[PDB]
Design a protein around this motif. Sequence first.
Motif, PDB file in Angstrom:
ATOM      1  N   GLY A 249       1.751  -3.803   5.192  1.00  0.00           N
ATOM      2  CA  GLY A 249       2.672  -2.685   5.162  1.00  0.00           C
ATOM      3  C   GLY A 249       3.031  -2.158   6.543  1.00  0.00           C
TER       4      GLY A 249
ATOM      5  N   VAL B 131     -13.775   3.750  -2.529  1.00  0.00           N
ATOM      6  CA  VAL B 131     -13.317   3.380  -3.884  1.00  0.00           C
ATOM      7  C   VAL B 131     -14.421   2.637  -4.596  1.00  0.00           C
ATOM      8  CG1 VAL B 131     -11.613   2.033  -5.221  1.00  0.00           C
ATOM      9  CG2 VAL B 131     -10.857   3.342  -3.254  1.00  0.00           C
TER      10      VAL B 131
ATOM     11  N   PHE C 157      -7.442 -12.190   0.429  1.00  0.00           N
ATOM     12  CA  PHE C 157      -7.127 -11.355   1.550  1.00  0.00           C
ATOM     13  C   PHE C 157      -5.923 -11.985   2.239  1.00  0.00           C
ATOM     14  CE2 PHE C 157     -10.967  -8.686   1.419  1.00  0.00           C
ATOM     15  CZ  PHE C 157     -11.808  -9.473   0.631  1.00  0.00           C
TER      16      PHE C 157
ATOM     17  N   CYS D 107     -11.205  16.630  -4.652  1.00  0.00           N
ATOM     18  CA  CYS D 107     -12.580  16.246  -4.964  1.00  0.00           C
ATOM     19  C   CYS D 107     -12.756  14.731  -5.184  1.00  0.00           C
ATOM     20  CB  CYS D 107     -13.094  16.998  -6.177  1.00  0.00           C
ATOM     21  SG  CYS D 107     -12.911  18.792  -6.150  1.00  0.00           S
TER      22      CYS D 107
ATOM     23  N   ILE E   1      -6.526  13.649  -4.883  1.00  0.00           N
ATOM     24  CA  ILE E   1      -7.042  14.976  -5.205  1.00  0.00           C
ATOM     25  C   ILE E   1      -8.101  15.359  -4.189  1.00  0.00           C
ATOM     26  CG2 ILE E   1      -6.543  14.950  -7.646  1.00  0.00           C
ATOM     27  CD1 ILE E   1      -9.477  14.251  -8.158  1.00  0.00           C
TER      28      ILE E   1
END
Lengths: 166, 168, 166, 168, 167, 167
Positions: C128, C106, C123, C81, C79
Amino acid sequence: TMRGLLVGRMQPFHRGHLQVIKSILEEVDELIICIGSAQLSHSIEDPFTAGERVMMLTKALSENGIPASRYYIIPVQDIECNALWVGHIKMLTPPFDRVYSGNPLVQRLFSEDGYEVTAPPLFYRYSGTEVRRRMLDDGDWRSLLPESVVEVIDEINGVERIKHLA
Amino acid sequence: TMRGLLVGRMQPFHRGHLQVIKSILEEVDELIICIGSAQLSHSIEDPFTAGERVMMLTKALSENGIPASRYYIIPVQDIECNALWVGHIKMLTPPFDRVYSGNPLVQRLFSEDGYEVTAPPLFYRDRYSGTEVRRRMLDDGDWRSLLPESVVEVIDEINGVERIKHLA
Amino acid sequence: TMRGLLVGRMQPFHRGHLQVIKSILEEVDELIICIGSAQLSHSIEDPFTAGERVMMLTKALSENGIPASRYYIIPVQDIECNALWVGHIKMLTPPFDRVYSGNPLVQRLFSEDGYEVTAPPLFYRYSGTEVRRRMLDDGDWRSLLPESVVEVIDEINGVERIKHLA
Amino acid sequence: TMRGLLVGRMQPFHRGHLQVIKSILEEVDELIICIGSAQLSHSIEDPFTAGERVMMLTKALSENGIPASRYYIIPVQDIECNALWVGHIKMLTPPFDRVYSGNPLVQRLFSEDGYEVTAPPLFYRDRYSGTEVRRRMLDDGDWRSLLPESVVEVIDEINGVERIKHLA
Amino acid sequence: TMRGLLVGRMQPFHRGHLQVIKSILEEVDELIICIGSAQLSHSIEDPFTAGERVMMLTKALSENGIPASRYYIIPVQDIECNALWVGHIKMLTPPFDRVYSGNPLVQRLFSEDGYEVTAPPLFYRDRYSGTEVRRRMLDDGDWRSLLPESVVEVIDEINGVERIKHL
Amino acid sequence: TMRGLLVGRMQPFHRGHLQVIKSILEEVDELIICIGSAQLSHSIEDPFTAGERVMMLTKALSENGIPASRYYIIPVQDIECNALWVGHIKMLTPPFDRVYSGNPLVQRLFSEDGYEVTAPPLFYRDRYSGTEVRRRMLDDGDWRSLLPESVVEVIDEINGVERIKHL
Ligand SMILES: NC(=O)c1ccc[n+]([C@@H]2O[C@H](COP(=O)([O-])OP(=O)(O)OC[C@H]3O[C@@H](n4cnc5c(N)ncnc54)[C@H](OP(=O)(O)O)[C@@H]3O)[C@@H](O)[C@H]2O)c1
Ligand SMILES: NC(=O)c1ccc[n+]([C@@H]2O[C@H](COP(=O)([O-])OP(=O)(O)OC[C@H]3O[C@@H](n4cnc5c(N)ncnc54)[C@H](OP(=O)(O)O)[C@@H]3O)[C@@H](O)[C@H]2O)c1
Ligand SMILES: NC(=O)c1ccc[n+]([C@@H]2O[C@H](COP(=O)([O-])OP(=O)(O)OC[C@H]3O[C@@H](n4cnc5c(N)ncnc54)[C@H](OP(=O)(O)O)[C@@H]3O)[C@@H](O)[C@H]2O)c1
Ligand SMILES: NC(=O)c1ccc[n+]([C@@H]2O[C@H](COP(=O)([O-])OP(=O)(O)OC[C@H]3O[C@@H](n4cnc5c(N)ncnc54)[C@H](OP(=O)(O)O)[C@@H]3O)[C@@H](O)[C@H]2O)c1
Ligand SMILES: NC(=O)c1ccc[n+]([C@@H]2O[C@H](COP(=O)([O-])OP(=O)(O)OC[C@H]3O[C@@H](n4cnc5c(N)ncnc54)[C@H](OP(=O)(O)O)[C@@H]3O)[C@@H](O)[C@H]2O)c1
Ligand SMILES: NC(=O)c1ccc[n+]([C@@H]2O[C@H](COP(=O)([O-])OP(=O)(O)OC[C@H]3O[C@@H](n4cnc5c(N)ncnc54)[C@H](OP(=O)(O)O)[C@@H]3O)[C@@H](O)[C@H]2O)c1
């Protein structure tokens, strides 16, 4: 240090809302005043724009002896997700401690987010429905509003607008 | 009643913005101050929320003896359509007569809608700008001296420095 | 009773993500797994749809011995905001206690909202970027994924898609 | 692999929905279950959030010995354009072959997009419906008996009854 | 009735786009022309509004004797989900059979939805492209010669050159 | 160049709308025709998509010998802010001078933005209206006679009657 929050459509801002605001200001250091349903304008129920209401509030709170350091005025559009509305308010406002509302949904949303919630200290002839009805029917709408708000309504041709829309 | 409009990100509100505002208040009765990109927060470029910036402006303008009757403070989210942004501003603000901006896009959008447009009466240097403020917040420089005290108090309360450092 | 939250793009879901998930499941009763940037698909960086990734996760977590009672899989669109994103997540998820992320934004968003936040316990070749590069260049992408995820990618013609887009 | 799709508000998830789901699982390999109107919460008609309903479904389907390999649970916000809603669903879900719905609009939208569409194999009566569940939550009736136990546990945890009563 | 679809920003509509359109009209009964990124205006890359481009296309196609029964002109805003964009186009257009695009993304999106997709029949050089048009508007070059006269008239009316220079 | 604007749902486009359009074209050089509530489809009140209505208008106006140089057809989604809707229309259309509407809201919104506003030159009766058209589609009445033949052909192609009956 102690900051309250109040939310209302204020279509338009009338003497009732002002009385409530002054009464809240006896219990908090600062009051955040949110103009709800900021997206709605140009209907019989919701005639005025967000901007027009910001103007009304800004002028009314200035014209009465309330120092600028004691309040904030913030337009708030409604959103589709009730579960996001409190976050929406928080993003748009200073930090606050207590919410004043008589509306069950507003109460419960804020309450679930951990805020203290209480009813407005005063309940108010001074209602927006009466104001709008009098604007439509050539009644005495002016006496229900602070003079600074009537001046806004004259400038923006509020009466002519609402009459045309009807 | 002659009403000006000013629009800026104000990330954060610094002494430069204030100087510009006071200069504009010499030539208009009232100034509408819009906090642009109100949607952007929690980045290095845009650290503070709309609400946090409303607080900064409200406190700063109050602390400097500018009467409340002479200004409006309004958060404004960006939108996807440039051709609609002026309508968006108009909806959110009192009626106004003149727009103050040095930004070519802002100028042209308002000018195409029939508004009088002029550059701000004052231009501040880079050393007093938001970029310098944010850089100093990050690098433990003297950021406080670039801001009105009322704004530094907001930044302390909301833990602004800690936020920006974590984000970096 | 103790519920963790994890958020990632998972473009696609690989053995790395699965290892991290199993490691988190040693510390929490249940794990909420959010598929971030659910709106992005059909690019080199973000080839797969939300739905395709839901499928990948659902199949992978089923094929490995993780009981259904221990996880939730939830697509989450980005989003505009940042100050609303945590509210957005909360609305879309069960209640949760702790967030696992190595991402500074985050971390800080969740931390400001009062959540406990910690880095992933593990880790991780398993990334990807490597997976996508191998899909493009006819490398051994299959060995980096759980078999259930390769089956998804075959069904949806993932390799052909990414090659055409390049 | 034959994959069905089902869409409902599930406010809340009750034994009726579950019965329908199990019936559908006799004729498909996998069932995609979409939680519709995911945006609506905190009303009498729609009390629970998307997340709360994800929790309800996830717990209920797990408690009834339906293997995880046989279903998907996906929150779906409504959108303004009916002509786009099927595309919206497709983007958010695995590929699927058949849609189960008794709703004329849902049927027609999916049918115009070339999907096979059929009515649910079972229709439950009003006395077991969400309306009855919510009414009983409000009036201190026996709402618990209409729900799987795993769903009642969700409702206790999130204070669902207190919420709905306050909202009324 | 065989119906093609073409989608482009057309910032602005130039002789190149028109040439391509006429070539496509040899192979289909009707052509749906979508104005992409309809939301973008008032930048150097995307100066004109949706409305301004609708005006340009409508005028240009009418000035070149292409009958009205053979085309449709439709503004299309971009959206955040690529997986929804084809549905978005479909909602805003008549039914269609074939998509003309050289763009890999547009090709693949339409192709995954089951549409026949093919490259445009003609490719115009960089010298006739929107980038060259906009550059010439900025630098007082001969931009007019790259556009149909009907489009030049639109650009004069809306003060397009003055806009792009100010920006 | 004097340019009028008309805005309506046109669910579907019927002979009444066409009559009004032709009357307006006696008084302006060009008419911008906006298809309002472009977002609404697949209901009893609003059965057809934006695209389907674009098709109807494009075909109908071409079949009745109105030259292409005299009109523009533009889909317009509703928005949540009434105070922004005129700006929304302006962005999506050519410049225009006068608005034709009998609707108080549309009148006042355009009027507050400084546009000249006037009622349509013709008012058609309820018997020829979209409500009557849709009712007849539902109840196997003579809906065809209320529409231009080109619009009937659109409705046959897109299975409009079958849709509305299922809904
Ligand atoms: N998801 C969302 O976007 C969301 C969720 C919740 C709420 N909201 C919004 O938040 C706003 C606040 O909700 P609301 O229901 O309180 O708005 P509202 O429309 O202002 O409703 C309050 C009603 O009670 C009256 N009232 C308020 N305070 C009073 C008092 N102290 N004494 C007597 N009467 C009083 C008002 O009278 P007057 O008209 O005369 O002022 C009005 O009729 C609304 O705009 C609502 O849409 C939005
Ligand atoms: N479509 C849309 O949504 C749309 C369209 C146009 C504009 N906008 C928004 O409108 C807002 C304002 O636009 P903007 O280009 O002015 O952005 P801005 O973020 O306010 O930046 C303008 C730059 O000029 C500096 N500046 C401003 N006034 C100055 C002065 N008097 N002297 C020296 N430097 C000065 C600012 O410095 P500081 O870093 O110190 O602040 C900043 O570096 C932005 O939020 C923008 O996104 C939105
Ligand atoms: N306002 C908003 O909408 C908003 C705000 C904040 C965040 N978000 C979204 O939230 C999501 C989460 O943010 P993110 O930055 O973590 O997403 P991300 O795109 O998954 O970034 C994580 C990066 O670090 C790697 N990584 C993650 N966990 C790892 C581990 N345990 N060991 C080694 N490498 C690891 C990932 O590798 P792989 O690619 O191989 O997995 C990826 O390259 C994103 O989709 C972001 O857009 C949205
Ligand atoms: N444009 C869009 O965004 C769009 C378009 C179409 C549909 N949708 C959404 O799709 C979702 C599903 O649509 P819907 O019409 O099915 O809504 P719904 O809220 O799921 O309601 C359907 C009604 O039928 C009942 N029902 C469902 N299955 C039943 C069965 N097997 N036997 C007996 N009663 C049954 C439900 O009962 P209960 O009360 O017990 O659940 C409810 O009362 C909704 O969220 C809707 O908003 C969205
Ligand atoms: N999710 C989404 O919203 C989504 C997804 C895909 C695409 N789109 C949109 O779809 C539209 C079309 O995509 P596009 O990639 O084709 O963009 P485009 O900007 O319309 O075209 C890309 C480039 O190709 C050139 N070109 C086009 N046809 C040509 C031809 N026949 N010969 C030579 N050069 C040619 C264009 O030239 P000129 O500069 O002369 O015009 C332009 O420089 C865009 O508005 C895009 O934003 C949106
Ligand atoms: N904020 C916003 O988004 C906003 C604000 C204002 C308006 N709008 C939109 O603008 C569009 C137009 O508004 P509208 O009020 O005119 O809606 P409308 O639905 O297009 O027309 C209203 C009614 O008037 C009838 N009518 C129209 N012209 C007539 C004529 N010349 N003679 C007799 N009857 C006539 C129509 O008949 P038929 O049924 O035969 O068509 C219809 O029944 C709508 O799509 C509306 O949603 C949007």
